[PDB]
Symmetry: C2
Subunit: 207 residues, 2 copies
Amino acid sequence: ARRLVMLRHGQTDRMQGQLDTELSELGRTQAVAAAEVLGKRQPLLIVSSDLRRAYDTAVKLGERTGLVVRVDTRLRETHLGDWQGLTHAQIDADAPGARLAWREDATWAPHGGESRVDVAARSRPLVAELVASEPEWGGADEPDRPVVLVAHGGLIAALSAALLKLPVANWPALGGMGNASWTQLSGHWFESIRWRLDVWNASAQVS
Amino acid sequence: RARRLVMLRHGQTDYNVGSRMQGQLDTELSELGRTQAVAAAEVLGKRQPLLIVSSDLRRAYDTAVKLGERTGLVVRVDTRLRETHLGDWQGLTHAQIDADAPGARLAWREDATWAPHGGESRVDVAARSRPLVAELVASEPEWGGADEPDRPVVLVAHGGLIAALSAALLKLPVANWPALGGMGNASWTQLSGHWAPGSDFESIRWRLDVWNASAQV
């Protein structure tokens, strides 16, 4: 069994998407806490979104583990198109039912943005590459050491649902990840690997 | 228009039952399992539960009692929260089962309609426990109500039950129920049910908020 951990950063300084928002100082200390916790699981590898709220969180885990943090733009949050930088009120004022529809339809995207299906399509190949290129992952010697992806709430829900092979209609069953939270899937005996959900949205600040 | 439903799995059980599949066998908590119950009571108690309903099997009930003691609530017991009955596999180890019925145990995990002889499938477990949730929706107007909408109902039960009931409420097709993994010792899960006022039980849209987080925090 290959363990795959996905970590969502803490507090930041209104739709963000791929805008490059910063962690607050609280968010920075939450990254430290998350590093202390996830560091005890001894990660095999760390891959991070290039967006600083994710990357700055990953760097603390890298410092705790002595691992490099590989960066990969395929882990970027959903691009939210015209919504980016807008408040809920502003979006609701142009389309009263849009945010609701979005939440309930994994194929729906804001104008100029990505749907959950798009985000899964672009991120899923990263996981396949890792299965192919990291024989230690779930290998005989240290089978429990997890690959850690440091990313975003939208990405994590989309990619998890895709790996679990849920039908598209059921992808909205996965709620939103909180601040400094983690999720874990395990892949059991790429295409023939069967993934199951071990943990969804547990706090990473505490163990 | 959101109701929170928390499901709690107990901690470690008695040393003397070893690795046998438990199912509806009435096994007891270990000493550690008892201190884990107290830790979980502290954590879940801060959520201000509205109601606590528990399986009658001692490992769940004794855990629920600690939460009731800490919150000032009395624990309701519902036999529909019992773990899957494992039929002829109850009391047996993995090695015994695999020796007798090679390939069965692993295939069982991947088929929520399959049941060991004399036992229940995950579908059976969901079918018997889903009505409890519907009865609670119907009889507890405070649940998701105006005064304190976020106070959760807490079901204290078992891993197989929590996976089956959760999958059923989320309306996953049975072919996809094996996507939910196992619950650990002293762990919790939360679903949120979202609905339009005046709508029936089936129209409630459930979302998975948390799966298998530590309840000792």
